[PDB]
Write a protein that binds this ligand. Sequence first.
Ligand SMILES: O=C1CC(c2ccc(Cl)cc2)CC(=O)C1=CO
Length: 133
Amino acid sequence: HMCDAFVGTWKLVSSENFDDYMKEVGVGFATRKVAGMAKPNMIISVNGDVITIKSESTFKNTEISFILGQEFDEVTADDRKVKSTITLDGGVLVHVQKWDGKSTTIKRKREDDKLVVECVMKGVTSTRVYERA
Ligand SMILES: O=C1CC(c2ccc(Cl)cc2)CC(=O)C1=CO
């Protein structure tokens, strides 16, 4: 029942500061431009202890399946190979990605009828808001 309120089909409706976040992560110019245009659909589902997050866009399709607290390998939309751990902190999904000595955190929370995503790289944050599709 853990993540029930996250389950569903979500579509991006707003983004703020995403180019600067991507720059801070180390994403190159061309990928930033094309990734920044995308309006992804994110499909979140749960089956037993396994959570699946799929993202579909004109840029890239991604899929991760995981168990809370259990590290896994992830290939990100910008083709980083990272080690990821996702936990729940007070109702917020907290997703840490580690690679090349670096780390970034993606937080996902329900707020009103939205799914709010905050991407943090050091001092740089981006907020991405999704609504039900
Ligand atoms: O899981 C993700 C991925 C995240 C992203 C996309 C592209 C790059 Cl280059 C870096 C990070 C954007 C996002 O909104 C999201 C929502 O759950």
